[PDB]
Design a protein that fits this description.
This is part of a larger assembly, with two copies of chain A (267 residues). Chain A is built from ten helices and no strands. The longest helix of chain A is centred in the middle third of the chain and has 42 residues. The first copy, chain A, is mostly helical and 267 residues long. Chain A is elongated. In chain A, α1 runs parallel beside α5 and α5 runs antiparallel to α6. Chain A has one domain. The interface between A and B is small, with 7 and 7 residues. It is classed as membrane protein. Keywords: taste, assembly, calcium, gap junction, membrane protein. Cryo-EM structure of a dimer of undecameric human CALHM2. Chains A, B: Calcium homeostasis modulator protein 2. The organism of A, B is Homo sapiens.
């Protein structure tokens, strides 16, 4: 579970690492903000989609309980980046500074430099402004930062409410109890780990047999020596068996005794 | 003739003497300029009208050759003040600074402080303006000074042309020659001076007679002693004679011999 938190720490570090330079300009601020805050979010979303074997299971089968799980396991990375970027400021103020109405803002009482200043307005984040505009721009700076931080806090709140609702609904609308669901999760984890390790060992001993068949002898460590001494092997399982293993498994009950996975259904 | 030049020197001195303070303000500049440049002109015009005995002669009679002469002898004082005030600057620029179009003027290229600056425009002559407006206001200052000096030079030119035309017309449309007109002018001057002095002396001796009749003797200097010893007196002329003297005299000719004044017509 801590992998997502490590990824979030890395996301914050990369935020403070790579670069940022607000291109004070009439109409490019909009696009630059949108891209520089969304493209890394999209990349993190893709990364989250990739390393979730549920999607490969699903596409191998080719449902709403699957999409919820996968998108929830994925979207934790883009959200903790969007929030960190909003709360940081200096990325919302860079994109929504041109759109400020120069009529409605109070300061050291002067109307405004002109009716020509829309390219002068959007130049504030680059801190380049005359002394009068210097004392003037703090207002719009603080206002935009205010809007950014408010959106950020509301985003955090909505994400929290959504997570709580998701949990309270998944527990309410599931056929099992919750303790048995914990047992089921432990079983899935243990089965996956044991299957991975056994597959590796079986494959290694098969390869050793193949090589020995060629040279006449195989060179091994003490460990692999034990691995061949204990476990023999003659040939893998047929393709239909592999095909039967893979797939999505919804909880099915044999008579009186439940099954917890497709490999279990292979009893 | 030099009295007008002495009055002009005094006018320039009083211009540089009394005061001037351009009331930088939206709409009072107009009125202040108009008054502070016209009221002294009107006063000088009245003064010129007063000390020209031709007007008293005329009203005593109660004609275009009289009005031309009087208004010409008068208007020399207001014109030499209007011209000195225009050429001086800092009195036209004070009144016609609000009316400058803020759109049509080129400088260090900025549009203009705002569309609120019409009370900021008319504040330039008071030299109170921010640094940007400092480098900006020189343009309107020089432009208004340009307009003032141009109007001044054109006024001088028109006055000169008018004087030349007046002379060339009065000599062309007069019954006499010009040398005899010079003789006539000398005669008017001499007659006025001699009449003034004789009137004074005759009056003084009459008063001396009156006083002596009262006390029994009159105390006098040596000069007045001679004045009574030489010239006797018994009584003034009747009122009809005084009435016959005064009045306007147009050149009338007795048979073969010209008359040059009403007192001369009293031959």
């Amino acid at each position: 579970n801590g992998l997502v938190a490590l990824g979030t720490v890395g996301s914050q570090e990369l935020f403070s690492v790579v670069a940022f330079h607000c291109p004070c300009s009439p109409a490019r601020n909009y696009l630059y903000g949108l891209a520089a805050i969304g493209v890394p979010a999209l990349v993190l979303f893709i990364i989250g989609i990739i390393l979730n074997n549920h999607t490969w299971n699903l596409v191998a089968e080719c449902t709403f309980l699957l999409l919820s799980s996968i998108l929830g396991r994925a979207a934790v990375a883009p959200v903790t980046w969007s929030v960190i970027s909003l709360l940081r400021g200096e990325a919302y103020v860079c994109a929504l500074s041109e759109f400020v109405d120069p009529s409605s803002l109070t300061a050291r009482e002067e109307h405004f430099p002109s009716a020509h200043a829309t390219e002068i307005l959007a130049r504030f984040p680059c801190k380049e402004n005359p002394d009068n505009l210097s004392d003037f721009r703090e207002e719009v700076s603080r206002r935009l930062r205010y809007e950014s931080q408010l959106f950020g806090w509301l985003l955090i709140g909505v994400v929290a409410i959504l997570v709580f609702l998701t949990k309270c609904l998944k527990h309410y609308c599931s056929p099992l109890s919750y303790r048995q669901e914990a047992y089921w999760a432990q079983y899935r984890a243990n089965e996956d780990q044991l299957f991975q390790r056994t597959a590796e060992v079986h494959s290694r001993v098969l390869a050793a047999n193949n090589v020995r068949r060629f040279f006449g002898f195989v060179a091994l460590n003490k460990d692999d020596e034990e691995l061949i001494a204990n476990f023999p092997v003659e040939g893998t399982q047929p393709r239909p068996q592999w095909n039967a293993i893979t797939g999505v498994y919804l909880y099915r009950e044999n008579q009186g005794l439940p099954l917890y996975s497709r490999l279990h259904k292979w009893a």
